[PDB]
């Protein structure tokens, strides 16, 4: 129900949440995860493109602003146990430069051992050769 408001304008397939987050409970309130739990709240000026809702892997907001939303639910201690490189990136690159949360599957969860090293090379190399590199908005892995 809460998400119905957003989906009055936004496309229910591509702008609908169809990844793992579609089926999980918000640990903070024990209710299903909703759009505002990640994006916050539209203002009356929403259609004009203003700093109302959070935007992930785009240049509007700083890495820290984007990533901190994730940490309203996730625990950095647990991210370390899942995959070591998390800690060094929490303040340094947008979480959604790697993860894709809206599609039916998140490509990070299915990478080969080889692929899970190639992402490091690809992005760190780009940082060395791309004068326009922006850690808030990285299209490379997409
Ligand atoms: C029309 C009445 C809207 C409803 C209701 C909601 N959204 Fe919206 N959204 C709308 C427009 C016309 C735009 C483009 C604005 C611009 O920047 O030019 C947006 C944008 C967003 C975004 C940013 C998309 C991106 O580029 O990353 C997000 C994340 C977003 N809207 C979310 C969102 C949520 C969570 C809503 C319900 C609480 C919601 N929108 C309602 C139009 C409309
Ligand atoms: C609560 C409102 C959440 C916020 C905000 C974010 N996440 Fe989340 N996430 C949440 C839950 C309850 C779960 C399930 C854990 C489990 O029991 O399995 C998850 C899961 C993920 C995953 C795994 C996805 C997959 O396809 O396997 C990822 C990669 C993930 N979360 C990342 C993530 C990011 C980057 C966030 C901010 C943009 C974020 N989550 C916010 C709950 C919540
Ligand atoms: C690429 C360098 C990544 C960045 C940037 C972020 N994450 Fe990540 N994450 C990445 C991989 C390759 C994996 C899978 C590890 C595996 O088991 O195969 C993950 C996993 C997660 C998970 C799920 C953990 C679990 O218990 O299964 C979560 C919840 C998650 N990642 C969240 C997350 C957040 C919040 C990030 C920004 C602070 C973030 N990730 C960045 C790769 C990468
Ligand atoms: C975290 C668990 C999220 C929830 C729940 C919702 N959104 Fe989302 N959104 C999130 C991320 C990490 C991204 C970047 C792209 C990706 O899939 O990882 C987005 C993106 C959007 C956008 C713009 C992206 C695009 O379609 O080009 C919009 C307009 C958007 N999100 C809206 C939206 C709606 C309506 C939601 C409820 C159905 C919703 N988001 C939930 C993180 C998360
Ligand atoms: C962009 C999508 C990135 C991906 C993929 C990976 N990293 Fe990265 N990392 C990124 C930035 C913008 C930075 C800061 C600038 C820099 O290059 O140093 C980093 C930093 C690191 C660090 C520094 C740790 C520290 O000194 O505090 C390490 C150790 C690191 N990155 C490792 C790493 C690994 C193992 C990755 C794949 C599993 C990886 N990075 C991917 C951005 C991105």
Report the domain count for the chain: 1
CA distances from 25 to 15, 37, 62, 93 (A): 19, 11, 27, 26
Inside any domain, residue 47: yes
Distance CA 45, CA 28 (A): 29
Measured in Å, residue 98 CA sits from the centre of ligand 1 at 22
Inside any domain, residue 33: yes
Inside any domain, residue 142: no
Residue 131 has phi, psi (to 5 degrees) of -60, -20
Tokens encoding 27: 């640990």
Measured in Å, residue 40 CA sits from the centre of ligand 3 at 22
Give the N- to C-terminal CA distance of the chain in Å, as an integer.
Answer: 31
Nearest protein CA to atom 35 of ligand 2, as residue: 95
Inside any domain, residue 136: no
Q: How was this structure determined?
A: X-ray
CA distances from 50 to 42, 71, 94, 95 (A): 9, 23, 20, 22
Structure resolution, Å:
1.7
CA distances from 64 to 18, 94, 118 (A): 25, 8, 25
Inside any domain, residue 139: no
Distance CA 28, CA 66 (A): 19
* Torsion, Cα of 43, 47, 53, 54 (10° steps): -160
Inside any domain, residue 140: no
Pocket of ligand 5 (CB under 6 A): 85, 88-89, 92-93, 97-98, 119-120, 123-124, 127, 135, 138, 141
Structural domain boundaries enclosing 29: 1-130
């Amino acid at each position: 129900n809460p998400d119905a408001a957003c989906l009055d304008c936004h496309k229910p397939d591509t702008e609908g949440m169809h990844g793992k987050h579609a089926s999980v409970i918000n640990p903070n309130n024990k209710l299903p995860v909703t759009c505002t739990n990640c994006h916050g709240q539209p203002s009356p000026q929403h259609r004009e493109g203003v700093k109302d809702v959070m935007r992930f892997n785009e240049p509007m907001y700083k890495v820290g602003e984007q990533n901190s939303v994730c940490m309203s639910c996730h625990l950095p201690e647990q991210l370390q146990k899942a995959f070591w490189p998390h800690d060094v990136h929490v303040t340094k690159v947008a979480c959604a430069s790697c993860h894709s949360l809206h599609p039916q599957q998140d490509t990070m969860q299915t990478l080969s051992d080889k692929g899970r090293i190639k992402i490091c090379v690809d992005c760190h190399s780009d940082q060395r050769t791309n004068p326009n590199f922006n850690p808030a908005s990285v299209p490379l892995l997409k």
